[PDB]
């Protein structure tokens, strides 16, 4: 009673990959036969069904329109044609086979991992804000920090003000420069790795969430944010 | 099989006067586990002093119990009328319950 | 906190006869009870001891084999079923809380006679 | 069915004083009178109690001690004698009937106010959450301007006394390792640890000494 | 440079307790020695202030009166009497030099935990309500454990005026009170209800339970 | 039903106190009293016991013989007397009615500090020695590591060797000097508050725990050792 | 250049000893000396030091008040009076000749045992809980664990909550005993040596440090805690 699982691997986003999944030791053509994925550092997670047929092949919908599963019955063989993938579906794809209330999955293939990416060996620049939350009342001086994981070039950092259910506008550039018809309260600074941005007597009206982003290469990256409350 | 043997038999004894009650045992009592009751005619048997030492609660300050091993005393420092009954010793430090044979207090 | 006994009298030897004690103010589930008879004129004399699931019951060898005591926590209710009785059987019987360490026999029932002749 | 309260004022701590309750409408000889206080925007708190001879006399712990509570029943008043006061028993305390299931406090008295008598400082945030190698910005602002900036930091690490940090608003203790820096003049100052360490998780607190009530900030926490 | 601080303990209300704190290490004689305590769970609060003598002496409110502070230059000791002790002088007291521009509180010693001490709690929802006239205001006081006889009360308090009975004996409506308020429940859950709003009902509702010898006010419901 | 209880404080080493604990609502003179304590952030821990008259006062292993347990049942009041007190007598003590069967600890008292110690603490340098355990083979090289929490003046800082049932045997002092027969593998360097200790290839000898110890004031200090398998 | 020691042993707690250190080869009365010891299996720790003419002895704060350093230059010997033993002096004792910018501790005695106990090897009932910790939210249930080394007789096994900075409370005895006022989501189960505490749906009033109790012997002993956040 085996799941042999074959493909995967490396591959440019938008490409194609097949996977299989080869059984033996039970009646394969009876049997409804499931993929499960699996991102890396994270939870199971349930990807498309196939059964008899006379019924309904199932996706989930992170992969409806794109991934075709199938089955070929006089091979013992279950396929999954992955279609115009994105960076989303990198995760390890395991073949399960789908016993419902005489097993739930009580077979699984070992496993494959896809990786969908373009870049190279290197990271982006990773842009780590702190504190995630800052609780403040008016008048009060808000300090928060940005620190990069690699120097940012020409100190090519900005902040950015986000209220609930609005665009995010833009404070300061080039690390210190405010924006245009942004108060003076507002200051940033710091060069390299460590930049600061400063609020020197909060205001009501600045409640909200600040993103730092670093624009000194071909890869934008943003900070999480930092959430002043 | 632990004997407990109450002394003397019968008390002759007036309102004030003092009441001193012994009971031995043929073996050491473990733990002091040794109790003392008050029957009076017709009605059931009533706690004065168990572990030897200690009085029941509300039980008037004038009966006190002392002793260890296999020598123990009761006392009633001044008798009153409500006193004079038949007194029971009664040792609990094993599976064989055992009893005194009495001493009536008249 | 009190014990409400039931049953005896007057019954033939080799009769039976069941002995009820019902209890009140305290956590009978959890303690300790047994039987004390007294025969007219005599002195106390423990018969039987009845403790928690997982103990053993124990019986004076005057009665082994022919007594039973058992309990209904339920009704927070202890029972001697007294069998193939004999003239030596007869005497006032007392149920009674044990508390050991903590009282000995704290707490009586008012006991009832039990009779045994013909 | 009345009852008419006396007594109260302004007195100095440790001082004395005495309160009066002087009943009419029902048979107070039989009544157990109780006193019951309210701090000065607080909820109702029960004092004392009092009630027939053969009957103990109550109190609460805040007040055991140092107030006595009495009875004439041939005057037909309630008394209360308070003694060594001091400024946490400040309130309004009031008499009141006590009827149990026939009332509770069915009656009570108009109650009569006892009272018993600088720079503020304020810290922001009041928490922090942060990990190790992040900055830490802690901030106190004074209510009026900090003479000569004579405002300083400790560190408080739970179980152990306060720890001396930065005094003269910048000036950084023997010992203290240079990632503590402190800054600002006249009403706000700022204490800003550069990368924190595990063992910086801790309260800190500000503390101004140019006069002649110091006074301390209510602590921040960091962890 | 040390404070060896002793004493303290826990005492009963209005008992006597003695502190001392023994310095070595600098010139005792000169320095500026304060007394600081901290509540638990609380901040640090200056007690009292001693100097060289030139003694004016320095005092709390708190401890006005009933503290006093004291120096033996020839033992290097200080020393903090507290006499007519309540319960909100529960607190760690911490001996220190005081130096000012110099250092301020730079020496500590380790302080003392002298604790004045020895129920059921009610707890009221919501803490606030906000609501117009007609409407529907519904009261709950939850107990942290049963009250036996359902002894519980409930009390309305307009600002500046004495507490008003409403409903004892978790039912019972008080002498002239209006039928649209109600009071229900049983063991450790009441409450009272004020059916249709009066602009002279917005006040401040207080539950109470007298079934017991330690009699205890829930913390209040302010209706606006 | 209540216990009331008073006194505690803070001592010196060796000193002595009693604590008292005063019984209402219940007959004290019929009941097992105990005391029980409690460290700073510890667990609960039982101390002693006592009960009616015919009966053994009981104590735990650490305070027989310095403890003493006792009551006076015509105040019905339990009493703790404490001699030669160290700092691990520090706790919160509780008085305690023991009802066993019926309660166990069924009341408590509300607890007092006992506080022990003798003034610290404190202006110690704390030395900190990195790694704890470094595994090698003969041949290999050691380094060991000892950070001090304050400059350590005129680098006064030694090295010892200890291996297990002897004496800690000097290899380092001053920081760098070799003491008289050791071989020169051996060898310290650091200043300030950064020592090192280097092993420059191990000997089957060499095995063996390791201590920094530095003595520039009138309060010594060790680290608490390296262990070299 | 020799330090001769002699003394130590076992001794009972509260109880007294006397060290000696007889030196051979210097100058004794020109050095200082030391006391170090090192409980077993820990470190090596300073305990008092001596030196010339003007007696300026040093203690550490352990020991301080309970031990007395003393010195006989015409005899050249060392001493160290140490009274008030607890549990936590057993350590081997070291006497050393303290050369400073010279030498350090060059010259060691080589050790004596000084154990202090009362006969402590433990017969005692161990109770085991786990999870230390359990983060849950408020509706989920708590289920706690208690494990004895032995079986528990009669199942006198107790429950405890303490909040902090308050007396524990009795929750549950007998194993399975609810105690008078406490809410019926609390309850206890289990036999022998495997115990269980269960709080149905939590509630914020809740969140404590739960303990269990055996007392079905002589030597009570208590669960280390679990702590619900």
């Known amino acids: 009673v085996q799941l042999v699982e074959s493909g995967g691997g490396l591959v440019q986003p938008g490409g194609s990959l097949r996977l299989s999944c080869?059984?033996?030791?039970?009646?394969?053509?009876?049997?409804?036969?499931?993929?499960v994925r699996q991102a890396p550092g994270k939870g199971l997670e349930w990807?498309?069904?196939?059964?008899?047929?006379?019924?309904?092949?199932?996706?989930?919908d992170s992969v409806k329109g794109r991934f075709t599963i199938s089955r070929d019955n006089s091979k013992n063989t279950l396929y999954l044609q992955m279609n115009s993938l994105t960076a989303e579906d990198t995760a390890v794809?395991?073949?399960?086979?789908?016993?419902?209330?005489?097993?739930?999955?009580?077979?699984?293939?070992?496993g494959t991992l896809v990786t969908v990416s373009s870049g190279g060996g290197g990271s982006d620049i990773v842009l780590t804000q702190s504190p995630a939350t800052l609780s403040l009342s008016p008048g009060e001086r808000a300090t928060l920090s940005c620190?990069?994981?690699?120097?940012?070039?020409?100190?090519?950092?900005?902040?950015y003000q986000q209220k609930p259910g609005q665009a995010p506008r833009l404070?300061?550039?080039?690390?210190?420069?405010?924006?245009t018809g942004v108060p003076a309260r507002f200051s940033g600074s710091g060069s390299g790795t460590d930049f600061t941005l400063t609020i020197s007597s909060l205001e009501p009206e600045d409640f909200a969430v600040?993103?730092?982003?670093?624009?000194?290469?071909?890869?934008?990256?943003?900070?999480?944010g930092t959430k002043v409350e | 099989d632990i004997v407990l043997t109450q002394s003397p038999a019968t008390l002759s004894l007036s309102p004030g006067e003092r009441a001193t009650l012994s009971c031995?045992?043929?073996?050491?009592?473990?733990?002091?586990?040794?109790?003392?009751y008050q029957q009076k005619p017709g009605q059931a048997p009533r706690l004065?002093?168990?572990?030897?030492?200690?009085?029941?609660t509300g039980v008037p300050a004038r009966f006190s119990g002392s002793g260890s091993g296999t020598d123990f005393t009761l006392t009633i420092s001044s008798l009153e009328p409500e006193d004079f009954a038949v007194?029971?010793?009664?040792?609990?430090?094993?599976?064989?319950?055992?009893?005194?044979?009495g001493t009536k207090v008249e | 906190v009190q014990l409400v006994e039931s049953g005896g009298g007057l019954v033939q030897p080799g009769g039976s006869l069941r002995l009820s004690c019902?209890?009140?103010?305290?956590?009978?589930?959890?303690?300790?009870?047994?039987?004390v008879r007294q025969a007219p004129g005599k002195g106390l004399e423990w018969?039987?001891?009845?403790?928690?699931?997982?103990?053993?019951?124990?019986?004076?060898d005057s009665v082994k084999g022919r007594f039973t005591i058992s309990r209904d926590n339920s009704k927070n209710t202890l029972y001697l079923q007294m069998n193939s009785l004999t003239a030596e059987d007869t005497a006032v019987?007392?149920?009674?809380?044990?508390?050991?360490?903590?009282?000995?026999?704290?707490?009586?029932?008012?006991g009832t006679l039990v009779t045994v002749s013909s | 069915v009345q009852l008419v309260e006396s007594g109260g004022g302004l007195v100095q701590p440790g001082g004395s004083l005495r309160l009066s309750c002087?009943?009419?409408?029902?048979?107070?000889?039989?009544?157990?009178?109780?006193?019951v206080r309210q701090a000065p925007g607080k909820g109702l708190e029960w004092?004392?109690?009092?009630?027939?001879?053969?009957?103990?006399?109550?109190?609460?712990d805040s007040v055991k001690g140092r107030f006595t509570i009495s009875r004439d029943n041939s005057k037909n008043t309630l008394y209360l004698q308070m003694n060594s006061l001091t400024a946490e028993d400040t309130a309004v305390?009031?008499?009141?009937?006590?009827?149990?299931?026939?009332?509770?406090?069915?009656?009570?008295?108009?109650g009569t106010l006892v009272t018993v008598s600088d720079i503020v400082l304020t810290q922001s945030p009041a928490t922090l959450s942060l990990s190790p190698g992040e900055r830490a910005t802690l901030s106190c602002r004074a209510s009026?301007?900090?003479?000569?900036?004579?405002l300083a930091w400790y560190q408080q690490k739970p179980g152990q006394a306060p720890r001396l940090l930065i005094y003269?608003?910048?000036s950084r203790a023997t010992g203290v390792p240079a990632r503590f820096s402190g800054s600002g003049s006249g009403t706000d100052f700022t204490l800003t640890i550069s990368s924190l360490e595990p063992e910086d998780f801790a309260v800190y607190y500000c503390?101004?000494?140019?006069?002649?009530?110091?006074?301390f900030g209510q602590g921040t926490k960091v962890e | 440079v040390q404070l060896v601080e002793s004493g303290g303990g826990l005492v009963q209300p209005g008992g006597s307790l003695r502190l001392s704190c023994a310095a070595s290490?600098?010139?005792?004689?000169?320095?500026?020695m304060h007394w600081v305590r901290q509540a638990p769970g609380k901040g640090l609060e200056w007690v009292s202030s001693?100097?060289?003598?030139?003694?004016?002496?320095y005092y709390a409110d708190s401890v006005k009166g009933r503290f006093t502070i004291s120096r033996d230059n020839s033992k290097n000791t200080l020393y903090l009497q507290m006499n007519s002790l309540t319960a909100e002088d529960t607190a760690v007291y911490y001996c220190?030099?005081?130096?000012?521009?110099?250092?301020?509180?730079?020496?500590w010693g380790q302080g003392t935990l002298v604790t004045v001490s020895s129920d059921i709690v009610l707890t009221q929802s919501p803490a606030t309500l906000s609501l117009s006239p007609g409407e529907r205001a519904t009261l709950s006081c939850?107990?942290?454990?049963?009250?036996?006889?359902?002894?519980?009360?409930?009390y309305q308090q307009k600002p500046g005026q004495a507490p008003r009975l409403?409903?004892?004996?978790?039912?019972?409506?008080?002498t002239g009170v209006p039928a649209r308020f109600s009071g229900s429940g049983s063991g450790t859950d009441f409450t009272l209800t004020i059916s249709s709003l009066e602009p002279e009902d917005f006040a401040v509702?207080?539950?109470?339970?007298?079934?017991?010898?330690?009699?205890?006010?829930?913390?209040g419901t302010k209706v606006e | 039903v209540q216990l009331v209880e008073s006194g505690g404080g803070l001592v010196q080493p060796g000193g002595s106190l009693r604590l008292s604990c005063?019984?209402?609502?219940?007959?004290?003179?019929?009941?097992?009293?105990?005391?029980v304590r409690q460290a700073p952030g510890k667990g609960l821990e039982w101390?002693?016991?006592?009960?009616?008259?015919?009966?053994?006062?009981?104590?735990?292993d650490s305070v027989k013989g310095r403890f003493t347990i006792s009551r006076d049942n015509s105040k019905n009041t339990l009493y703790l007397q404490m001699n030669s007190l160290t700092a691990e007598d520090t706790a919160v003590?509780?008085?305690?009615?023991?009802?066993?069967?019926?309660?166990?600890?069924?009341?408590?008292?509300?607890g007092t500090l006992v506080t022990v110690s003798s003034g610290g603490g404190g202006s110690d340098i704390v030395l900190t020695q990195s790694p704890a355990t470094l595994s090698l083979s003969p041949g290999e090289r050691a380094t060991l590591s000892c950070?001090?929490?304050?400059?350590?003046?005129?680098?006064?800082?030694?090295?010892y060797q200890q291996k297990p049932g002897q004496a800690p045997r000097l290899?380092?002092?001053?920081?760098?000097?070799?003491?008289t027969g050791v071989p020169a593998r051996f060898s310290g360097s650091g200043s300030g508050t950064d020592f090192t200790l280097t092993i420059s290839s191990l000997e089957p000898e060499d095995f063996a725990v390791?201590?920094?110890?530095?003595?520039?004031?009138?309060?010594?200090?060790?680290?608490?050792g390296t262990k070299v398998e | 250049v020799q330090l001769v020691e002699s003394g130590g042993g076992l001794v009972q707690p509260g109880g007294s000893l006397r060290l000696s250190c007889?030196?051979?080869?210097?100058?004794?009365?020109?050095?200082?000396?030391?006391?170090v010891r090192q409980a077993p299996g820990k470190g090596l720790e300073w305990?008092?030091?001596?030196?010339?003419?003007?007696?300026?002895?040093?203690?550490?704060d352990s020991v301080k008040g309970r031990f007395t350093i003393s010195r006989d230059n015409s005899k050249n010997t060392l001493y160290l009076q140490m009274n008030s033993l607890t549990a936590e002096d057993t350590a081997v004792?070291?006497?050393?000749?303290?050369?400073?910018?010279?030498?350090?501790?060059?010259?060691?005695?080589?050790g004596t045992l000084v154990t202090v106990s009362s006969g402590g090897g433990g017969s005692d009932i161990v109770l085991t809980q786990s999870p230390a910790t359990l983060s849950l939210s408020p509706g989920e249930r708590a289920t706690l664990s208690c494990?004895?080394?032995?079986?528990?007789?009669?199942?006198?096994?107790?429950?405890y909550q303490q909040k902090p900075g308050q007396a524990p409370r009795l929750?549950?005895?007998?194993?399975?005993?609810?105690?008078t006022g406490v809410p019926a989501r609390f309850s206890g189960s289990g036999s022998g040596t495997d115990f269980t505490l269960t709080i149905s749906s939590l509630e914020p009033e809740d969140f404590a440090v739960?303990?269990?109790?055996?007392?079905?012997?002589?030597?009570?002993?208590?669960?280390?805690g679990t702590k619900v956040e």
């Open positions: 220190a030099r005081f130096a000012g521009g110099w250092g301020a509180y730079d020496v």
């Open positions: 290490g600098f010139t005792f004689r000169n320095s500026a």
């Open positions: 001693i100097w060289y003598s030139g003694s004016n002496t």
């Open positions: 009026q301007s900090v003479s000569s900036n004579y």
């Open positions: 003269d608003s910048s």
């Open positions: 503390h101004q000494y140019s006069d002649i009530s110091p006074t």
